Design a protein around this ligand. Structure first.
Ligand SMILES: C[n+]1cccc(Br)c1
Lengths: 156, 39
């Protein structure tokens, strides 16, 4: 199937019509998405198959065809861009200054942007175009608004 | 059965729409990968 680097929609035909369940990143021959999008299932790319290679429910991440390749990190100061890929709509860049999730194990960047559930796995980028994490695992705050962690994996 | 379809290149867009606030939140992460607010 298609191995070209870039952002991809993750679709299923199990439900009514063709439904977008999430999004992912192809980089260095590896497909990267959030665990809750695929539940670790195999994926099809044209006539080819992509098998899971690494995954972790707690990190909510999964890689296909090889180990996790994305290692850029938010610098903690600069605006970033969400490359949102919503269901049935064109890819669009949204610039924002991340907030912070403070946890008992350290702080993580967070983006306060609200998109349909099927946008999970969309990449968040720095000014060099590097993927610093994936959008789609977060929380609902007091005023009912959605804030996503900037979720990044480890490159072994 | 799940399948992927290319949606675009990964690049920074000069003069993209700028929005969203930057909240600082105390959160907890459980073993199932769910984030929750700590109050
Ligand atoms: C689970 N969830 C809810 C709202 C937006 C996104 Br992206 C993911």
């Amino acid at each position: 199937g298609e191995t070209t680097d870039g952002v991809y929609r993750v679709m299923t035909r199990r439900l009514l019509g063709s439904t977008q369940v999430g999004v992912g990143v192809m980089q260095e021959g590896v497909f990267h998405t959030m665990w809750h999008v695929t539940k670790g299932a195999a994926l099809r790319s044209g006539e080819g198959r992509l098998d899971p290679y690494w995954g972790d429910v707690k990190q909510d991440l999964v890689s296909y065809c090889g180990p996790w390749k994305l290692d850029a990190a938010w610098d903690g100061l600069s605006e970033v861009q969400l490359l949102a890929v919503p269901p049935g709509e064109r890819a669009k860049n949204i610039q924002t200054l991340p907030g912070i999730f403070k946890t008992k194990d350290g702080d993580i960047g967070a983006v306060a942007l609200d998109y349909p559930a099927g946008t999970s796995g969309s990449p968040i980028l720095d000014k060099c175009g590097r993927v610093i994490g994936l959008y789609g695992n977060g929380v609902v705050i007091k005023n009912g608004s959605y804030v996503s962690a900037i979720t990044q994996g480890k490159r072994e | 059965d799940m399948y992927i379809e290319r949606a675009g290149d990964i690049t920074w867009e000069k003069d993209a729409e700028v929005t969203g606030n930057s909240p600082r939140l105390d959160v907890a992460l459980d073993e199932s990968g769910d984030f929750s607010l700590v109050e």
